[PDB]
Design an enzyme around this catalytic site. Structure first.
Site, mmCIF file in Angstrom:
data_model
loop_
_atom_site.group_PDB
_atom_site.id
_atom_site.type_symbol
_atom_site.label_atom_id
_atom_site.label_comp_id
_atom_site.label_asym_id
_atom_site.label_seq_id
_atom_site.Cartn_x
_atom_site.Cartn_y
_atom_site.Cartn_z
ATOM 1 N N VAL E 45 77.771 27.925 -76.130
ATOM 2 C CA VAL E 45 78.708 27.350 -75.178
ATOM 3 C C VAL E 45 79.595 26.406 -75.980
ATOM 4 O O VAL E 45 79.163 25.876 -77.009
ATOM 5 C CB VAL E 45 77.980 26.544 -74.082
ATOM 6 C CG1 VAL E 45 78.995 25.985 -73.090
ATOM 7 C CG2 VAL E 45 76.952 27.433 -73.368
ATOM 8 N N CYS E 46 80.816 26.188 -75.506
ATOM 9 C CA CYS E 46 81.748 25.287 -76.174
ATOM 10 C C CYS E 46 81.331 23.831 -75.981
ATOM 11 O O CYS E 46 81.073 23.395 -74.859
ATOM 12 C CB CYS E 46 83.171 25.501 -75.655
ATOM 13 S SG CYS E 46 83.905 27.086 -76.122
ATOM 14 N N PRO E 47 81.266 23.087 -77.080
ATOM 15 C CA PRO E 47 80.872 21.676 -77.036
ATOM 16 C C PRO E 47 82.043 20.800 -76.561
ATOM 17 O O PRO E 47 82.260 19.695 -77.070
ATOM 18 C CB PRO E 47 80.494 21.396 -78.486
ATOM 19 C CG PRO E 47 81.536 22.171 -79.222
ATOM 20 C CD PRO E 47 81.566 23.500 -78.462
ATOM 21 N N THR E 48 82.792 21.298 -75.587
ATOM 22 C CA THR E 48 83.952 20.580 -75.079
ATOM 23 C C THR E 48 83.606 19.281 -74.376
ATOM 24 O O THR E 48 84.281 18.270 -74.570
ATOM 25 C CB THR E 48 84.739 21.467 -74.141
ATOM 26 O OG1 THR E 48 85.094 22.661 -74.836
ATOM 27 C CG2 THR E 48 85.997 20.762 -73.681
#
Lengths: 162, 162, 162, 162, 162, 162, 162, 162, 161, 161
Positions: E45-48
């Site tokens: 998952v994107c560490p946004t």
């Protein structure tokens, strides 16, 4: 927590546009529902939070979202309050009454020492799975726009697994 | 039943014409008290039962008797009702809020089914001993005069033991 | 309290002008009943409370209402009292004996301290549901008219639900 | 059984020659006491048993024996009955009332399903030790003369150990 | 709920800008704290969400706010991740490892069947009182902007009661 | 009490006129029975009580009455005693040995600390119902005459209810 | 097994050559003791066992060994049996009577369904420890000579440990 | 001890040469298995232990011995560690991730206060029985060669019992 | 039981010709190996016991100690020691545990047989179980791998970090 | 336990050179003597065991049986039998009871030592305990008094009343 769990059964009287309706878990089925709890009607707190929601109701109704605001007040009270505050008057969504706290407790959201619900908002998907939770202390407001942002994101995710 | 038993201690928020006040059993020690329970505020039923009591506040107050009406509604709702209903407006006696249902339960007068108190009246002597209990269903109303007759009898019986 | 609950089954011996009879809850099904509890027979207090009820037996009987007075005295004592006291003699309603105290306890109206029932009256509708409770201490008396007002209200409320 | 055991404490109102007295285990102290239990006052049974006792009361009072008849009737009833039956009128000994059955139960002599005491006679020596017991079914009489014979024998034995 | 309740004692190891330190409930005493929980390091998952918060780390710092990201990964894993991802490398706030899962369970935030914390943020005042809760299912990001707003709002309500 | 209760099942060995037999509750079914208990064989007290009963064994026999003397001695001991004492030799009724003490305990007639039965007589009707009880301490004899009277009286009351 | 356990406290009446005495564990302290249990006095079985012990009692007393035969019969019966049987007559050791069965039970030697002790002999040393626990069923006899051998053997082991 | 007990059912995610797989007790049935537990990935301690096993894995696979290294880190971390360490890189056996700690607990190998597994190796035979249960504290290493010797020894005993 | 402290115990045992008593105190301040086995005098090979024998002088020079344990009495150990040549090489304490308390303290009892399982425990000077090794019948214990664990345990005690 | 029926049990034991299994069934339909003692190979004199040996051929001719019992295994009994001359005379089954079940069935366990007390039990053909004899150490059992009780027990079985 309660996140990612299925809501429990329930039977509550409500107030929606002049008429008194009854609600159950059945009505939530297949739909996206938002349970917006608040402590009490007729206080001196700004009825602003419920108003923000009302202001976005049309936009939510478009997304196929049902809104139920909940207080441990009787649906009778919701009626009299809906015709007192000019803000509350804007409310077109069902206003559930939970004088037995049963609905409130199903969501682990009762302030037991007060007999009133906490400021919590729940997002339930079509399958009954709680997908978003938000609770705040008296005074910290809930942004109706952030609520929308999340309802959209929820749905996008429901359709784009992984 | 609770007849001839002492009232359990309590602490509730109340509305007394303008001011919100905190009432406890400490407030009842020394005085003759009357706890007038009822289902709810803002209902479509007749606030007659409550108004009538006001009609006799004169005398009752003369008789050194205080009146605490009780419902599981919050004191906030009592205020909004007091100044939104004619009969309710006559009330100069303390209007207790019991949203936790604790006071109601000390008086074993709760509709666990609805989260509302039943139509019940209690006469408490200065020692905190319940001297008279009266409970009726929706429709059968309580009679203010009959209540006063009892209080007088109760006061008298006290004066000349047995 | 016992308000709005169904009466527990019972079987007691009674005195009904001349004859001893066995009364049970089976006898109360279908009728409107009134259970008039009192401390004891042959006391030096005023049999007024009981006599007055007789004064209205006319009407009550008209209203399809039966009257069962109850004390923890045996039906033998009721008989000897009925025909040894003027006012007691007016009684045409069944006089129940409850020496085991079971009937009294089903109505949670026992002075465990003395082995006597407290001054309490109960109105039971045809379904066996208690509709009105009244309990007073020694001295504060019960009012026959007030009792009849309730029964009428109770009967009426039944006719036009809510 | 209860034989040879010490009586338990007790506090009961009684009727003795017109006046209402109170009795406790204290009064039994140092004395020879006879507890004569019977089921109920004002029945149709021949009041003969109590009469036999009364007929030998003078003779017993001479032996230094106190007599307490006991029924679960209130001392009030004993009064009214003492002035109704010509037999009962002869009674000069205390007529205890045990409406709480506590005295009756101390002697394991309660007919639990009836709320009435069984036909039992107990002989308690000066130290409180039960020295003679007799119980019979409704209908089998107790001979007051056999009671005397035993009270004498008890005392002789108390003074001539072994 | 956990809203308006006090955080519990805890002791964990964390990675903070190149070094390993210990954090306990005692380090939060007197400051505003944000406990940011996520399921796992090194997933896809994107560490946004954690990047967002790093971007605002200066705002929160000027505001007297401490940030603690929490996962059930060890602090060794955090140190490593802090080098793999460019996004994670922005993080200057403390990264808490919770392999025992105690800190996570204190916040009732454990997915028991996966042994991973849910996506939840907690805003805690200088007295350790939880003033805001936010929890979302996978895919529904959390906006660092909405968190700042709520924090300012909380700081405001604590210094302007009404 | 045991008055008006049903005797329990039992099986004991006994000595009866030169021979050993077994007696059970089934031998009492259909007959009137007297259970005569005494502490012990071969003691120094005068065996007058058991002699009395032997003297009337014919009366009781003509009356359809069975006599059973009971002690916690064995039947062997009874056989022997039946030869030592001239008084005991008159006995024609069954002498029951109760070393297990079960028959004695059924009648709640055991001096537990001595393992001996108390001086008690029980009159039992053909249905096994105890109609008369008599118990006395050592030294206070029991008259066989008073027992006959009570027995005739019991037989009378069973055939003349009223 | 009771082998190697300390005997328990007891207090019984006994018949020892002419008179009645009281025996307790105290009497056994400091001496070697033989507790000889048997079912019952006056039965039809020859008292060979008790007589053989009687024959060797002078020798046993030399060895400082006290003997206590025990049965559930009373000391009264022992006296009568003693002065009525050739064999029993020889006995000069105490004959304990155990009608409460406590001593018998202390040695776990009761035939509960018969209320009689089993045929068992226990050798107990000066410190109260059981050193030989011979027990046999009805019919399987015991030898006094063998008992003497065991006692000598036990006395030796106490002098020459290991 | 877990020696000689059957392993328990489990289901974990693992990283095996390039991808993620699911391992359950099913995968072990019919084979010889080595469960190699270690505290944590990316710590500062050299992965000599895991590497030596890696060096002998071809030999182990010849012997039909499957290897599963286990730690409470996630499979995600195993992947990152694998593709970032010389030694770890050699590993071709499955690297199980046990973040819920269940597998670790199954083998009672959890350092509860650290949430990390202890340094333990378990040899499990085709029937699921643990045959060698080497466990060491931090710092006390394990030898792959010695492990191989044990496995050969165990495999031999299964072929040549006793 | 890894990383836990041993419990208190009192058993009778044998050691080079004479009988002695062994308690946790004897282990207090010392290093120890508790070597459990099923039974003295069986048809199985006392390989494991003879094995540990050889390194005993060496373990002793390390202040280290060895206690073999089974649910046989100390009397039986004395008999076995003076009968089996393998067993005769033993110079360490042979603990008897007929009540099974010591065995159960180490959770190493086969309840269905009243015998202890084949299990080795390494206990440090503070009484903490570090090097635990347990194996089924037929799987041997390398008196060499044990020694390695003991030295590793001592090294870590002396040089933390 | 006098006059009660023995319980079910399954133990390993030794009998004249070979291993066998003994259960209550073996006693079903037979007469038996269960002879308990503390331990094989101790310094105490196997007097009692050698004693019972001599009358074994005789007991066998009475369909009577003897089982000695201790909490040692059957393997140990085999060792003791082929080592002590006194024990070598034994031809009856030597039951091993390492779990203590048989011993506890007869309520004859010294819990503090994991060893059975010195106790003899006479069990009739229907499994009822009749001639029970238990004595402390040093107090001997007369293989003669036992036999007398066995014959008395058989006589009563054959001639009631």
């Amino acid at each position: 927590s309660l996140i990612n769990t299925k809501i429990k059964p329930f039977k509550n009287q409500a107030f929606k546009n002049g008429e008194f309706i009854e609600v159950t878990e059945k009505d939530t089925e297949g739909r996206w529902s938002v349970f917006f709890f608040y402590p009490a009607d007729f206080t001196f707190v700004c009825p602003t939070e419920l108003g923000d929601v009302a202001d976005h109701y049309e936009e939510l109704q478009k997304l196929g979202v049902d809104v139920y605001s909940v207080s441990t007040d009787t649906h009778f009270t919701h009626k009299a309050w809906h015709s007192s505050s000019e803000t509350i008057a804007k409310i077109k969504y069902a206003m559930i009454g939970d004088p037995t706290g049963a609905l409130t407790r199903n969501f682990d959201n009762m302030r037991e020492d007060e007999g009133l619900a906490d400021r919590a908002t729940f997002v339930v998907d079509p399958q009954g799975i709680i997908q978003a939770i938000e609770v705040t202390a008296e005074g910290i407001g809930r942004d109706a726009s952030d609520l929308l942002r999340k309802i959209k994101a929820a749905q996008y995710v429901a359709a784009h697994p992984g």
